[model samples]
Target chain A: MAEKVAVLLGGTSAEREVSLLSGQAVLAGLKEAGIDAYGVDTKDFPVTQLKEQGFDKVFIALHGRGGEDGTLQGVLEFLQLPYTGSGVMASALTMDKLRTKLVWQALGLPISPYVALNRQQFETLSPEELVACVAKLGLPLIVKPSHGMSKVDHASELQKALVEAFQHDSDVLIEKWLSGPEFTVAILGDEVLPSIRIQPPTQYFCPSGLSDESEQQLAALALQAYHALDCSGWGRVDVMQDRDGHFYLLEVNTSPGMTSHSLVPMAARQYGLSFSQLVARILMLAD
Target chain B: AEKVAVLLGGTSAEREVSLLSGQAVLAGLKEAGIDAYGVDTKDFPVTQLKEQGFDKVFIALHGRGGEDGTLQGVLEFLQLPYTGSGVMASALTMDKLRTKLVWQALGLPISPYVALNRQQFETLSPEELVACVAKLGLPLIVKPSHEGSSVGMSKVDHASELQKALVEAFQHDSDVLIEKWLSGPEFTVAILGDEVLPSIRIQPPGKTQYFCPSGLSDESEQQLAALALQAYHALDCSGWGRVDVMQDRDGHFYLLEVNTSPGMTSHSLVPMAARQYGLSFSQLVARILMLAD
Candidate 1:
């Protein structure tokens, strides 16, 4: 392989600021490991210049749209440069939460029930029609846009939430809100790292207090979801457990947050891999 | 004036067809008073589009690296706007099995199919493999999941021919599909922007005569257009494309596939349908170029 690495970050996406921070952390970690690494803010830097600029491999730290949505992966594949995270297909699939759920459900994986509607469909419906269609998912639904999620209880309230969600994306998924503890699992190559339970409001990450059996079940489901989406290298999967002790897949992040405070790094710490070693391991898995 | 590059004749199984399509698009764009040139991706490096100062592209390339989103990804990275779908739609629609799965999940009509990847096909027992054929039943059509122009496809009529058909398709792509053949009339619908053009009935010469009007009632035509539009949007395909569908004897419509960057040769279905709608080749190709956002 490649000794010289290009850490691509600070893209023209909503997460540019976060990507810049992650890029710096990764750059320092790579240099600490004695690799010739350079940080590139893809917004101003022409990534098409990477090959001619003599870069060998890519460590993509950019998130959202152009970066995590398979366009960059496709460009890297065309350039024949090994990069971190999933390939084009998996990256593209995971970028769309609605389609990701469709694939997982097709593979017999458990996922929360939701109504997937596009802007055109949502726009065409009458006021009553919009509420009627969204109401099928029942009350206390989570309206998920391309970026974030919102909780809605009433049909009219769901319609208003959808209107706001469409501002973020043309397609939106409104899922039946699950009343349970939310958890996240990070996958590095074949090794599934320790699960972290995310308690909101404080946004704290801690080891899941489940028994070994439940943790194993969640780990198995996470790996299966990863493989179902054909994800590899490194990624994060979000899940929620109901009061009945059942797990439901929420979403898969192909190029998840890698900031020092990111969930992946936090979970890696629990698995005995330091921040520097985790970034190094991710670069080593690049292909 | 923005410089337009008509990408064509890529390293794909359908390069010959792509060349014809590219030439036609190039001529039409030139006739429409645009500064356009032909660029065979096989002979030229795509990264040079910037060095060469190409502002936009009209993708006429087909199959594999071209139609399958690899080049689109490259263009997106280069920040060059191109014709037809984006990376996700281009990649998703290129894989026929996944396209079918997405359609099925959306409750769209499609023929029942049994998908087998390379690993599954190679390790499965002969008896177990033949059992798949029994599941989809006889007169099944086996096709490589990612090929265009019906490249590695076979219609298996006999039970013994299934293995040979599978091997033939495997030569083209790792993932293969054995679909229950729909015994019905095939129609190709062209969509320009948000409007669905008139549908054209296709017959492979020896089968049935080609019907431009499709000889269907107005209501049936509308139904076909609605289904075609749904299939088009289901794959998130924008700009323009052609959707292939088969109508069963019961009058039910089943989607075949969506061609994101469809063939635009003089004999191609898109231009043919456009001509029937009073748009000349130049006007039709110009409209597509204008919509290349």
Candidate 2:
């Protein structure tokens, strides 16, 4: 292999395990496509050495914190390395659950109802105040900031969930749980692939099977949501439907899982792009 | 001065302006009896900042590539203390659309407007934009989302001129923000540590273009300072920055934008406010570097 391409993985984050898996799969897929790619775990190798390592480009496969957050992207930018996925602004904005919803909310996009509070504010909440919030937003409410998304059935459990949530992010948010189907839409450059429903649930995957009109609506909404954050290269936009079937954007995964059974590959595969082909296309879209 | 590196010229929309700011900062830091030198990011790679024997950085570069968090990350990655907001805040403040969105979600006041991307500006009719943002009415302010100062900004006095302004703004950034024009006086609030300098009302020979000791009511002066502080704190801004606010026709103040690493030129608003607050240019520069985190 004449070219040196680094596939970033195994960052210092809670998602390190998944990141290694995603990066491993990406490394293998790129190799299958005849790319000169190597898996470089960022945990051991400081990104400051990427340029000196003489890599021409990067395939970012790490998830969360230092990887998906703007910090790593910013480092890549200053190094002037062409990397796959979003830039500093988009990466940072999407990494923050509260800020992501805020950007979508101001754009008049449909999002689950949420209440935000800082650490000090969360600590000062009383049972009566908690009840007031629950009565307004209704259950099952979800407290954001976790590796696996979960829900709370009552106000009594809200505090415990929030305490757990605060550990991951400084900002804590309580959102009304979306009860209907959940979806993950794949975006490559300007194209928004058909969405896949994760209904059966980290849940099994099946084609979203949206009606022509509904799929059109979902596609339009997903692209708007994706572009709203200025996300580029390749990424996934997670959305959900309310009981009424109106789709609401959940979040945009700038560095989505690229494992063998990843949702992005699933959507791209159904859209007629194989895993190797998908990896190649994502590489082509890099800056 | 501890061998301060004044990061200056770079490949951003505001490159020339950044050079001027950096040169001014170099002079100010020198006057404060510090050993400082300039580094053009275009000429010298940020990766060499540590080996250059620079203990601290005074970022004078404006707009994208510098104040937008990229260089901040480079400094942080190298473990060098730099001025202004951290990575997330820098990125957030540079994006006008998202900054307003965050502020609006937090129930902060911002002028009514519509967000436009190159796709929307191309696909949708110009009349469609006027119709959507018509609520903000004519005499709207159109500007690029990520640019600083008045780079690609224009005042659209009529609905007919909206598209041309949008075209000009889109040349600078893919995203354009159309804002409701404020008819009242504009004030720039400069924050240095916990102190908020007396607000300067720009438009009547001052603020950025020259006025200090704004003749507005004492009550309103305190009110504007509080408003600016909230907007600043909301973005998690640190070190020093300037919050530009505009008053609507009815006298309600709405935030314009926050300059995380504001200009330090002779005509810069932050220096003017600092001067009015009893801090010399050299004193201001020294204080800013002292508080660098």
Candidate 3:
């Protein structure tokens, strides 16, 4: 029974292309659900206009950076506009992969082992020392930061790791590669979707090759990860199994993609919720 | 900043402290020749801040509505950079238990504590509660997870006093923490833009005393200062903030918490720490305002 809704999308993030598709699909689902809704690209229109334009609520469909981060959520909170998905703290906290990893680690959540190598350490350490540093994590290390990633098998190849991924003035993480069978669990308030399979890239929904126990375990882990960050409304948590067949948390998507074919809706179908119903329920869950 | 809004006096339990903080901050900013004015969120509508021609904000408000992420959110939406941390850090640091979680995760030193929410406390049996805190030993501190200025804090010398302490803490916040008390001097370290100001140690022989130099050897002072920076930047605190650290009997510095918008009253600890770092009250406020956003 939402009066007027703004399905926020098309933010100035690397995920803008996907966000556009996500928003258009969300707008269509809202229309199909009999709600008055319109699409707004934050890159084109300042968010201040949402209140001025008389939109009563927001359906955040944007992905990554500006939109998914707490800054946009903060803007929405100040506007007093109820929006779907997590609020300021969770939105901000999860956006930072480093901080999010630490939070989960602190709470005794299972995550892949990683070492943070920083700017000061890089220039100061000898090449052999640096290689030895990353070498301790074992071969096939993943260097992450800067929306950049690398998997170095040989010590000699580790040189390319920093150049490709070091978005520094920041620290770079040399993570123990989580050779996947990755999975994403979508949560709609109390309901958690089945873990979807991803071989580095998200491949499909349901009937994921996990045993029932493992599935339940992953669901609980994902829910715990989401709640640990205090995320509300709805969102998705990403996890991957390491070489030991042990699952590790990767990240949480506070404002995940929302195309009908998107993971959340695709996973939702297993729970018997249609695209229109999913979108409508998401909007209804807004606080 | 052309027109500054010193946001203060909000709908938080620390309203009285905040009002005094705001007055002091606003007075200091004005004296330093910045065109700053006070705006209380209790009566003043924050939505009108931008419309009323405020270019930036100096957040002098503390505790729930002000020091928490909510006000920082409003300031972010307004696009007016304010003093102290952003929304996430402000929100994260405000919840004492969660802040420790992050610090602990990042390999920062912190005291051991058991966190309990209202729901858990309501259903917890006395035997169960005793078992929960048994690992931490006696003389533990019980405090609200989301309060500042040591609000609703109590030291339980014996197991008999734990329930009353929990009741008092739970009144201030839904989440409460039972921490292993460290029997040593507690010190406050203030951080300004790119610099850790001098450390201020609190000597309490039951009557509290403030120590500016802390009289620690240069090496120990440097160690605490470095530890303070790690705690500060670990949460990615911006502008200016304060970090509380306590020394254990083993000479280890255990971090207590980070205060995003600390007190700005004339005799406030941050300013006291700031003065030792060679900045006057007006200079300190002006420096903070300059680094806003």
Candidate 4:
């Protein structure tokens, strides 16, 4: 008998629609692979709802805040329902960018210099003062919101997509966009996939513009980032190189794009694995 | 023969109080003919706590710098035998908001209090804060972060007093807790070894309005003690500690704090409750040592 897998998606976060897309993709893929699958959108979805739905296993496809911040994981732990990705502790650890960076710095991982500021501190800071702190981290530094990347919102319409995008790209993904090339790396267990190169357009090297070469180059850099972050089993990483051609660590994407247009499948195809096969394999690991 | 170190005095609001506790514990240990001595925490590095010469530690330290898991991390790194919870548990308990969130996430019922200090006050309109406070109703308790014990504690009855209470609170700690005041009697529960002792009822005895040790009720004592033990285990606190709870006007028990290193003065709540459990001073010390990993 096939496992009854609940593909949990869509939450009260901005990324709800994207989560639904991810959930649908996973559900379809699981079914295609002959496993019984159920899709759960978290708009008004409670723990009791999951229990009522009766899934033998849960594959969390939701992203950002409430879903990603280990709230759901803690509930699952309380319910004793095993799920995919990290457990409660690891899930909580990864959600906190500040705390994760502290651990990384303690572990001697190289990171760009930056200061954390609450909204009030950000207000007190003059642009010059902010720039001065950024200068210490060196010019061209990234300034994304700490504890970011939430993917929860209403699943009923495109408005959810807009909300999701707004929240995920909050405050602006200000970074000293590395002047050189970038790449991506993905990991599955101990098996490493070929890196995807993101060749941005002329301006893609800076803040804007995109080209086929830059896109391919970015895909490769993302894969390289995956390995550097020690992410395993269906996770992605983003990597970029500075002006000196030295690669700087970007961010880790534990919940990489999983739809047909998603980079994981694109990279998987580059590695000669079919999209269906990749999804099927990921589900198998969940069981 | 291995050495036993009594770690005391850290950089925190409770530093002086910690030192006193340390001195009293060290004296008691010596009087009992046990081999233990005081080590001023700041003078010695964390490694000294775990020096191969020391077999165990009586962690009489308190507040953020020492009790808040920074030193616990060091002890964990050195694999030292120190009293109280491990690094993660200690750290979590010290952060009031985070602790509430974790417990809240566990679906545990907590007091509905809006967290605010300076920044939150600035962003939110006074009307909004007044509204939130109104929701909590009159006579709310303002607590400093981490239950560091009242450099910033206030009982606000009306909306007019909120600002001053918050200002005075900010002077003490960066974080502040404004909890819905429970309109009931207060009690404390102390655990020694694996046993939950009798509960301590905090009542007005002549002059004092809170935490009076001279009065007692047998049934209320047993009830408070059981509720405390349940709450302690709910948070997975091992070793020894005390849990404070208040009875609402409706007679429901409301949890307040879990002191990992409680004050042990003869009239202190911990020892008073411990005495109810039939544990003497030397036995309490022995139990603390037994509980230390």
Runs with alpha carbons beyond 4 Å of true place in candidate 3: A1-6, A27-45, A49-56, A119-128, A146-169, A200-202, B30-37, B43-55, B74-81, B158-161, B203-207, B249-251
- A1-287 per-residue lDDT for model 2 (tens digits): 47689999998899999989998888888989999999899889989789898998999998977777777888899888899999988887787777788778878898878887665456677756866866778878777762224488966777778778878755777777668778888999889888887765257555677788988899899998998788899788988888888888989989899888888888888899899999999998878
Off by over 4 Å in 4: A1-287, B31-33, B105-109, B204-223
lDDT of 1 at B80: 89
Shift in Å, residue A12, candidate 4: 40
Docking category for candidate 2? Answer: medium
| Candidate 4 structure lDDT | 0.62
> Among the candidates, what TM-score does chain A have in each?
0.89, 0.88, 0.91, 0.70
DockQ of structure 2: 0.57
CA-only RMSD, every prediction: 3.0, 3.8, 3.2, 22.7
Measured against the native two-chain assembly using Cα atoms, what DockQ does each of the candidate structures obtain, in the order listed?
0.62, 0.57, 0.55, 0.02
| Worst lDDT 10-window in candidate 4 chain B | B100-109
Candidate 1 error regions (>4 Å): A1-3, A24-38, A144-159, A201-207, A266-281, A284-287, B207-209, B249-251
Clashing pairs in 1: none
lDDT of 3 by residue, A1-287 (tens): 54888998897889999999999999998899899999999888878668988999999998887777777777777678899988877888886777888888998899878887655567778778888776668988888771277878888888778766665425577887657778999999778987788764335747677899999999989998998887889999999887777889989989888876788988888888899999988999999
Instruction: State the weakest 10-residue window (summed lDDT) of model 3 chain B.
Output: B65-74
Per-residue lDDT, model 1, residue B81, is 83
Which TM-score values does chain B get in all models?
Answer: 0.95, 0.92, 0.95, 0.87
Decreasing TM-score order of the candidates: 1, 3, 2, 4
lDDT of 3 by residue, B1-293 (tens): 49999888887778888899999988888889999999998898776799899988899988776666877877776678788888888988877877888889878888888899898999998779989999999999998987776679999999989998998988988888899989778889999986998888897766588878988899988998889988888887889899988888888889988889998887799999888888889999999999998
Worst 10 residues of 3 chain A by lDDT: A199-208
Estimate every model's Cα lDDT from 0 to 1: 0.86, 0.84, 0.84, 0.62
